[PDB]
Write an enzyme that holds these catalytic residues in place. Structure first.
Site, PDB file in Angstrom:
ATOM      1  N   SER A 137     -12.620 -39.982  -1.573  1.00 19.64           N
ATOM      2  CA  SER A 137     -11.525 -40.699  -0.928  1.00 19.64           C
ATOM      3  C   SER A 137     -11.923 -41.835   0.012  1.00 19.64           C
ATOM      4  O   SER A 137     -11.060 -42.609   0.422  1.00 19.64           O
ATOM      5  CB  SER A 137     -10.608 -39.731  -0.217  1.00 19.64           C
ATOM      6  OG  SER A 137     -10.011 -38.856  -1.135  1.00 19.64           O
TER       7      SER A 137
ATOM      8  N   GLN B 208      -1.981 -34.971  -5.610  1.00 18.09           N
ATOM      9  CA  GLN B 208      -2.557 -35.295  -6.910  1.00 18.09           C
ATOM     10  C   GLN B 208      -1.511 -35.699  -7.924  1.00 18.09           C
ATOM     11  O   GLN B 208      -0.400 -35.158  -7.949  1.00 18.09           O
ATOM     12  CB  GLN B 208      -3.325 -34.102  -7.500  1.00 18.09           C
ATOM     13  CG  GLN B 208      -4.327 -33.462  -6.549  1.00 18.09           C
ATOM     14  CD  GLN B 208      -5.545 -34.336  -6.258  1.00 18.09           C
ATOM     15  OE1 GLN B 208      -5.640 -35.473  -6.711  1.00 18.09           O
ATOM     16  NE2 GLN B 208      -6.489 -33.791  -5.497  1.00 18.09           N
TER      17      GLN B 208
ATOM     18  N   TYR C 111      -0.520 -37.417   2.888  1.00 14.01           N
ATOM     19  CA  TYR C 111      -1.686 -38.051   2.242  1.00 14.01           C
ATOM     20  C   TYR C 111      -1.629 -37.791   0.749  1.00 14.01           C
ATOM     21  O   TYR C 111      -1.473 -36.648   0.315  1.00 14.01           O
ATOM     22  CB  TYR C 111      -2.953 -37.480   2.862  1.00 14.01           C
ATOM     23  CG  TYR C 111      -4.246 -38.105   2.385  1.00 14.01           C
ATOM     24  CD1 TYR C 111      -4.916 -37.592   1.271  1.00 14.01           C
ATOM     25  CD2 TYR C 111      -4.788 -39.208   3.039  1.00 14.01           C
ATOM     26  CE1 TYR C 111      -6.129 -38.135   0.858  1.00 14.01           C
ATOM     27  CE2 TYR C 111      -5.981 -39.772   2.629  1.00 14.01           C
ATOM     28  CZ  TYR C 111      -6.644 -39.225   1.539  1.00 14.01           C
ATOM     29  OH  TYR C 111      -7.839 -39.741   1.164  1.00 14.01           O
TER      30      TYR C 111
ATOM     31  N   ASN D 185      -2.965 -39.197  -3.324  1.00 11.11           N
ATOM     32  CA  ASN D 185      -3.572 -40.056  -4.336  1.00 11.11           C
ATOM     33  C   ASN D 185      -2.500 -40.695  -5.195  1.00 11.11           C
ATOM     34  O   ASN D 185      -2.666 -41.821  -5.654  1.00 11.11           O
ATOM     35  CB  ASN D 185      -4.542 -39.264  -5.207  1.00 11.11           C
ATOM     36  CG  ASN D 185      -5.710 -38.754  -4.416  1.00 11.11           C
ATOM     37  OD1 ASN D 185      -6.133 -39.417  -3.477  1.00 11.11           O
ATOM     38  ND2 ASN D 185      -6.233 -37.563  -4.772  1.00 11.11           N
TER      39      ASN D 185
ATOM     40  N   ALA E 226     -14.141 -36.997  -0.287  1.00 12.85           N
ATOM     41  CA  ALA E 226     -14.979 -36.077  -1.042  1.00 12.85           C
ATOM     42  C   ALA E 226     -14.621 -36.130  -2.523  1.00 12.85           C
ATOM     43  O   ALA E 226     -13.549 -36.645  -2.901  1.00 12.85           O
ATOM     44  CB  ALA E 226     -14.769 -34.665  -0.520  1.00 12.85           C
TER      45      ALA E 226
ATOM     46  N   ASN F   5     -19.661 -31.244  -0.943  1.00 14.87           N
ATOM     47  CA  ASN F   5     -18.409 -31.360  -0.197  1.00 14.87           C
ATOM     48  C   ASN F   5     -18.391 -30.308   0.919  1.00 14.87           C
ATOM     49  O   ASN F   5     -17.977 -29.180   0.704  1.00 14.87           O
ATOM     50  CB  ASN F   5     -17.241 -31.134  -1.153  1.00 14.87           C
ATOM     51  CG  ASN F   5     -15.908 -31.161  -0.449  1.00 14.87           C
ATOM     52  OD1 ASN F   5     -15.811 -31.613   0.703  1.00 14.87           O
ATOM     53  ND2 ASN F   5     -14.877 -30.662  -1.120  1.00 14.87           N
TER      54      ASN F   5
HETATM   55  C1  LIG Z   1     -12.196 -34.637  -6.893  1.00 14.32           C
HETATM   56  C2  LIG Z   1     -12.166 -34.336  -8.375  1.00 14.32           C
HETATM   57  C3  LIG Z   1     -13.490 -34.086  -9.070  1.00 14.32           C
HETATM   58  O1  LIG Z   1     -13.555 -33.828 -10.305  1.00 14.32           O
HETATM   59  O2  LIG Z   1     -14.565 -34.147  -8.437  1.00 14.32           O
HETATM   60  N1  LIG Z   1     -11.183 -33.343  -8.682  1.00 14.32           N
HETATM   61  C4  LIG Z   1      -9.857 -33.686  -9.112  1.00 14.32           C
HETATM   62  C5  LIG Z   1      -9.269 -33.033 -10.185  1.00 14.32           C
HETATM   63  C6  LIG Z   1      -7.976 -33.387 -10.567  1.00 14.32           C
HETATM   64  C7  LIG Z   1      -7.274 -34.373  -9.892  1.00 14.32           C
HETATM   65  C8  LIG Z   1      -7.854 -35.019  -8.817  1.00 14.32           C
HETATM   66  C9  LIG Z   1      -9.141 -34.672  -8.437  1.00 14.32           C
HETATM   67  S1  LIG Z   1     -11.311 -31.919  -7.901  1.00 14.32           S
HETATM   68  C10 LIG Z   1     -10.192 -31.924  -6.535  1.00 14.32           C
HETATM   69  O3  LIG Z   1     -10.964 -30.833  -8.792  1.00 14.32           O
HETATM   70  O4  LIG Z   1     -12.664 -31.564  -7.536  1.00 14.32           O
HETATM   71  C1  LIG Z   2      -8.763 -34.059  -0.264  1.00 11.91           C
HETATM   72  C2  LIG Z   2      -9.505 -35.113  -1.015  1.00 11.91           C
HETATM   73  C3  LIG Z   2     -10.799 -35.512  -0.365  1.00 11.91           C
HETATM   74  O1  LIG Z   2     -11.405 -34.701   0.393  1.00 11.91           O
HETATM   75  O2  LIG Z   2     -11.310 -36.643  -0.579  1.00 11.91           O
HETATM   76  N1  LIG Z   2      -9.721 -34.730  -2.379  1.00 11.91           N
HETATM   77  C4  LIG Z   2     -10.526 -33.585  -2.718  1.00 11.91           C
HETATM   78  C5  LIG Z   2      -9.892 -32.377  -2.982  1.00 11.91           C
HETATM   79  C6  LIG Z   2     -10.654 -31.264  -3.298  1.00 11.91           C
HETATM   80  C7  LIG Z   2     -12.032 -31.344  -3.379  1.00 11.91           C
HETATM   81  C8  LIG Z   2     -12.664 -32.552  -3.118  1.00 11.91           C
HETATM   82  C9  LIG Z   2     -11.920 -33.666  -2.783  1.00 11.91           C
HETATM   83  S1  LIG Z   2      -9.335 -35.741  -3.578  1.00 11.91           S
HETATM   84  C10 LIG Z   2     -10.676 -36.833  -3.942  1.00 11.91           C
HETATM   85  O3  LIG Z   2      -9.001 -34.999  -4.764  1.00 11.91           O
HETATM   86  O4  LIG Z   2      -8.219 -36.517  -3.072  1.00 11.91           O
END
Ligand SMILES: C[C@@H](C(=O)O)N(c1ccccc1)S(C)(=O)=O
Ligand SMILES: C[C@@H](C(=O)O)N(c1ccccc1)S(C)(=O)=O
Ligand SMILES: C[C@@H](C(=O)O)N(c1ccccc1)S(C)(=O)=O
Length: 358
Positions: free
Chosen positions: A61, A117, A147, A149, A315, A340
């Site tokens: 992010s 998401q 917050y 995406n 993250a 993370n």
């Molecule tokens: C962040 C991301 C990833 O693959 O690293 N992931 C994600 C999955 C679906 C929608 C948006 C992000 S996650 C949160 O499962 O790790």
């Molecule tokens: C919450 C956010 C972030 O920390 O950047 N997301 C995340 C969610 C789960 C695991 C890692 C990151 S993200 C990139 O899906 O928006």
């Protein structure tokens, strides 16, 4: 390096790495126009590849700061206005709940409850249209921050539409290239694969998965050197020669909304400096950072405030990053890690370092 910087950084980061079991980490301190770099551990555990100043990390992010500045640059170019209705840039978005939802709302998570998401089931462009058409707000526009995406990601996609450029092409040509971020990528090219760290989650090597609006919301990869240059560019926007980018950087640090003691910019978030460290440390925890909170409109938005703590956590499944800087002090930090680990640990370490140096 200056011993104060060496000692402050090592005394803070060594225990952090131990406590959080971080496989690899890179840190930059930007102090009075010069960067100082530090690395630890492994980019790739199995291949025994160390973290170097050329290692690429997934910013997660933290990418939203690039999105916000690219949007700022599009405003400066006269291509979009934050006051424009979303439907101006997506005329197929005909559902009535979009009346009154502007690009500003998308950019700043204030559209009224767009979700964190985009659903995983959204795989096609038609799927994306149906998602936004069918989405029902919980709140009137400009009243609550959540917050998301799905909010800023759509902002980034729409912001580049008048240019006719893809989001990636716009980012590369309008932000990365002028700032000489030559090792910063939305899609890691084959030439850079040997430098691309693995992320680690539950002991497994992972890279970010493809998803809708990924580039716009969480999809940039960068090195510690390019990230230090990114901080310097946001510390000293008037040194940027390209007028629209110079302006766009400043627009991203304008204060559009207040919740608690923080102010929402475009991607960046800001607090007045000096900060209460408890407020940024505790405030960074997802229990607060991802919560729906009432916002006060700043009418009109305050131009970028020099005496600010400006920052962004971010993250992916396998990475954790943080960037913070204080324009009035010409001071900043970048922390990139391939695990993370919890936001408050990042912010605590950053504040200890910057507070000891300011
Ligand atoms: C962040 C991301 C990833 O693959 O690293 N992931 C994600 C999955 C679906 C929608 C948006 C992000 S996650 C949160 O499962 O790790
Ligand atoms: C919450 C956010 C972030 O920390 O950047 N997301 C995340 C969610 C789960 C695991 C890692 C990151 S993200 C990139 O899906 O928006
Ligand atoms: C610090 C200063 C500068 O550029 O020298 N300015 C700034 C203010 C907020 C954020 C970043 C920079 S400025 C252009 O207002 O004078």
């Amino acid at each position: 390096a200056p011993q104060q910087i060496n000692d402050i950084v090592h005394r803070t980061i060594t225990p952090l790495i131990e406590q959080q079991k971080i496989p690899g980490m890179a840190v930059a301190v930007i102090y009075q126009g010069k960067p100082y770099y530090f690395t630890w551990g492994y980019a790739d555990i199995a291949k025994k590849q160390p973290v170097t100043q050329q290692t690429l990390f997934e910013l997660g992010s933290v990418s939203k700061t690039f999105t916000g500045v690219l949007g700022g640059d599009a405003i400066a170019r006269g291509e979009i206005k934050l006051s424009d209705p979303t439907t101006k840039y997506w005329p197929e978005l005909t559902a009535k709940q979009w009346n009154g939802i502007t690009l500003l709302h998308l950019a700043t998570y204030t559209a009224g409850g767009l979700p964190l998401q985009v659903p995983d089931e959204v795989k096609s462009s038609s799927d994306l249209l149906r998602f936004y058409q069918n989405w029902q707000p919980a709140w009137a526009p400009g009243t609550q921050r959540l917050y998301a995406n799905s909010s800023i990601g759509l902002f980034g996609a729409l912001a580049v539409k008048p240019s006719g450029l893809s989001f990636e092409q716009a980012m590369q040509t309008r932000v990365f290239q002028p700032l000489k971020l030559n090792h910063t990528w939305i899609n890691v090219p084959p030439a850079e694969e040997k430098n691309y760290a693995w992320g680690y989650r539950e002991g497994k090597a992972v890279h970010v998965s493809p998803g809708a609006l990924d580039a716009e919301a969480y999809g940039v990869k960068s090195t510690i050197e390019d990230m230090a240059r990114w901080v310097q560019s946001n510390l000293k926007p008037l040194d940027i020669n390209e007028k629209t980018l110079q302006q766009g950087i400043q627009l991203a640090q304008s204060r559009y909304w207040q919740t608690g003691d923080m102010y929402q910019g475009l991607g960046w978030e800001m607090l007045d400096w000096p900060v209460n460290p408890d407020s940024i440390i505790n405030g960074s925890d997802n229990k607060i950072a991802l919560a729906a909170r009432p916002v006060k409109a700043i009418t009109p938005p305050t131009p970028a405030v020099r005496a600010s703590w400006v920052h962004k956590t971010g993250a992916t499944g396998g990475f954790g990053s943080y960037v913070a800087f204080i324009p009035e002090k010409e001071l900043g930090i970048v922390m990139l890690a391939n695990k993370n680990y919890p936001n408050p640990a990042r912010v605590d370490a950053a504040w200890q370092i910057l507070n000891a140096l300011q």
